[PDB]
Structure 1
Amino acid sequence: HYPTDDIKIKEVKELLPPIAHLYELPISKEASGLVHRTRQEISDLVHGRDKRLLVIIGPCSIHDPKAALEYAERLLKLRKQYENELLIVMRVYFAKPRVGWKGLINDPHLDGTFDINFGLRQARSLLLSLNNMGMPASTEFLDMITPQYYADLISWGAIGARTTESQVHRELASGLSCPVGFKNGTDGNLKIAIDAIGAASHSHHFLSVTKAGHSAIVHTGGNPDCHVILRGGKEPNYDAEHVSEAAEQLRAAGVTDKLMIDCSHANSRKDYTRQMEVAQDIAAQLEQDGGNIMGVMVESHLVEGRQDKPEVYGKSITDACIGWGATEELLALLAGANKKRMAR
């Protein structure tokens, strides 16, 4: 026999099964309540039963648990203060969808050693600490296996621009315990996200692993808590005209016309200093009408900007983020605007 199997494979190493991580780090009664409740609260937002604004906000990527926990500590205070106008959940994303650093799960030690057992442990550990302190977590799931390791700790999931059209990621979302947001495509196709909600609301089958770590078929029940995310395209799509047009196509498709607006990425034009602009336009809509907005997303860290090496504490090494002060302003701006909308 000529060889035909694993020709271009350096190594296939066994990973500790999810059950191993769940044994060391069982979810606590407290994290369980914060998760269950935040998910329900978000459901109400998706389906129009509450007019609070869901704010997904935090670092572009997590590369340092200390800074992440310190960021949460400061955010927790504002989560409480604006709890009547805003439902603040923290971005706990472990990589960018990219060339550069491959994320915290792949490369937890920031040196190129790919210790993914440790990476996954750290991600779970972080997510339980956060929930335990009272800060819910959100994340993007890039693949169909990692969710088994910590989705139990996640109160809101994203499927990014580059995966919203992928069948298997829609099948994933259809079984995720948390509400899920589908982003529009990298060039501004909103339809792919609309179809994804359709798909995600039905029952599907996809492949993954059991909690015990073995190949498996997953039969989902459908996810009725999905929604669109406006993150821009060739041009930005945050304004009232783009919101109104999205809302119409949503209704026509017979899915929720309540949606979320990313202030960052292509809606800012990859310029962190324009997130405030977007949030200001969103504030104007809320004060006017803004019936179709249920959430915003905001890339934010202790220190503003980007760096290639993790030199500065609390500075992103993936996309550029606004800093803490700009975070106080933006959140305040949104809370006040939405106080007025809810008051009508």
Structure 2
Amino acid sequence: AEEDVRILGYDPLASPALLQVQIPATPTSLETAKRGRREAIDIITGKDDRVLVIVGPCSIHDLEAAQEYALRLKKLSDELKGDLSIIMRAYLEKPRVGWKGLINDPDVNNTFNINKGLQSARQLFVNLTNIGLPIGSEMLDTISPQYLADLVSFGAIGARTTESQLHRELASGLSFPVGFKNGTDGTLNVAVDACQAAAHSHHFMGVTKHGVAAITTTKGNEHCFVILRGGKGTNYDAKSVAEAKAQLPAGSNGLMIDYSHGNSNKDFRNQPKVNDVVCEQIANGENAITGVMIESNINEGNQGIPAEGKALKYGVSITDACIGWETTEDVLRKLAAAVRQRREVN
């Protein structure tokens, strides 16, 4: 009998329940999460005319820098809350080459420690939600969300998994809105199909809170939407948006636009130009644009990890390039103005 010839070992994993006791959610974390969800729901279904904003770092390698970022984001959020509902990006990895993410390599020293990773991720998420800021993250697989789901207001399925049956089944049992990205080829038919699929009940192999594989029956998720993110070209302009709307069946949730990634084509400086174009549409009465996504840090750009380890410029991304804090301020103020102007066209 020949099995496990390419398995080096099975390493012990703390169960979700074990981590949920060890790093407990505060009342404020839990309330913050549920509020982010309600607000998101009202925006994507058209009941609120504010725009949903998912903004923050490409990924979080540094919990302390992330806390200092979050505080600025939260104060900005208090001021702009008439117009914008703000959820911080609390993403753990970048689509894989270079740094393997906070779950895999939380000490940013190219080793593995998935257990300490899940602890860091959970501690992060609690730290952020506890100051009253809702968070969003990528839904990576069927296991890790069980460690974190109590804290999350928004879940994303990346371009690379929108087609994946398992991620569509998973999205169908999650306790929050899920955005599906358009395919890496730059078409959205895959994200429309994901939304439809995810709206139905499925059965997938999940894990229970005690860390055992079990058959998991889902209810279906009515709060999935499509996220425009470019690809093979950019797709944030009015013609692209018109074609996107032409593909959504009646009763669709609103569209979200990502300013980064394929939309900014290899230059983070392009994010504010994406905002200008998206604001012009929203100002002019485009009610189908209900969300945006922005890769923002304290300081702009990105950096490689140098011979010296985790010790690295503070508040600078080690995955995708971000716009810096002051650009983010300008960018978000200008969006809120668009929002108010759309109100008056309406």
Same fold (TM over 0.5): yes
Determine the structure 2 residue equivalent to 1:77.
75
Structure 2 SS opposite 1:87 = strand
CA contact (8 A) 2:260 2:268 kept: yes
The one of 284, 290, 307 equivalent to 1:294 is 290
Structure 2 counterpart of 1:94, one-letter code:
L
CA contact (8 A) 1:174 1:203 kept: yes
1:97 Cα offset (Å): 1.2
CA contact (8 A) 2:157 2:178 kept: yes
Determine the structure 1 residue equivalent to 2:316.
315
Report which stretch shifted further, 19-28 or 291-300: 19-28
| Cα deviation digits, residues 149-186 of structure 1 (max 9, x gap) | 00110000000000000000000100111100000001
Determine the structure 1 residue equivalent to 2:178.
180
Report which stretch shifted further, 260-269 or 30-39: 30-39
Structure 2 counterpart of 1:43, one-letter code:
I
1:37 Cα offset (Å): 1.7
1:11 Cα offset (Å): 1.6
| Cα deviation digits, residues 106-139 of structure 1 (max 9, x gap) | 0001112211111111111111111110111100
1:28 Cα offset (Å): 2.2
Aligned CA distance change for structure 1 residues 255 and 233 (closer, same or farther; 3 Å) = farther
Structure 1 SS opposite 2:10 = strand
**Structure 1 Cα separation of the partners of residues 35 and 93 of structure 2:** 27
Determine the structure 1 residue equivalent to 2:267.
271
1:208 Cα offset (Å): 1.6
Structure 2, unaligned runs of 5 or more = none
TM-score, length-normalised on structure 2?
0.96
| Cα deviation digits, residues 289-311 of structure 1 (max 9, x gap) | 21110010000101100101151
CA contact (8 A) 2:14 2:115 kept: yes
Structure 2 SS opposite 1:319 = coil
1:257 Cα offset (Å): 5.0
Q: Does 1:330 align with 2:315?
A: no
| Cα deviation digits, residues 272-317 of structure 1 (max 9, x gap) | 0000100000010011121110010000101100101151001001
Please identify runs of 4+ aligned residues in structure 1 that moved more than 4 A. none
| Cα deviation digits, residues 295-344 of structure 1 (max 9, x gap) | 10000101100101151001001011111111111011101111111233
**Structure 2 Cα separation of the partners of residues 191 and 227 of structure 1:** 12
Structure 1 SS opposite 2:148 = helix
| Cα deviation digits, residues 27-81 of structure 1 (max 9, x gap) | 2222221111210111111111111010100000110000000000110011111
1:255 Cα offset (Å): 4.1
Structure 2 counterpart of 1:303, one-letter code:
N
CA contact (8 A) 1:52 1:342 kept: no
CA contact (8 A) 1:246 1:257 kept: no
**Structure 2 Cα separation of the partners of residues 25 and 297 of structure 1:** 29
Q: Does 1:48 align with 2:46?
A: yes
**Structure 2 Cα separation of the partners of residues 76 and 222 of structure 1:** 32
CA contact (8 A) 1:200 1:226 kept: yes
Determine the structure 1 residue equivalent to 2:206.
208
Determine the structure 2 residue equivalent to 1:217.
215
CA contact (8 A) 1:156 1:179 kept: yes
**Structure 1 Cα separation of the partners of residues 242 and 337 of structure 2:** 22
Structure 1, unaligned runs of 5 or more = none
Structure 2 counterpart of 1:325, one-letter code:
E
The correspondence of residues 73-222 of structure 1 with structure 2, limited to 5 A, is: 73-222=71-220
The one of 280, 298, 305 equivalent to 2:301 is 305
**Structure 2 Cα separation of the partners of residues 199 and 255 of structure 1:** 14
- Count of aligned residue pairs for this structure pair: 340
CA contact (8 A) 1:128 1:153 kept: yes
**Structure 2 Cα separation of the partners of residues 26 and 205 of structure 1:** 29
| Cα deviation digits, residues 186-224 of structure 1 (max 9, x gap) | 111200000000000000111121000011111110111
Report which stretch shifted further, 239-248 or 311-320: 239-248
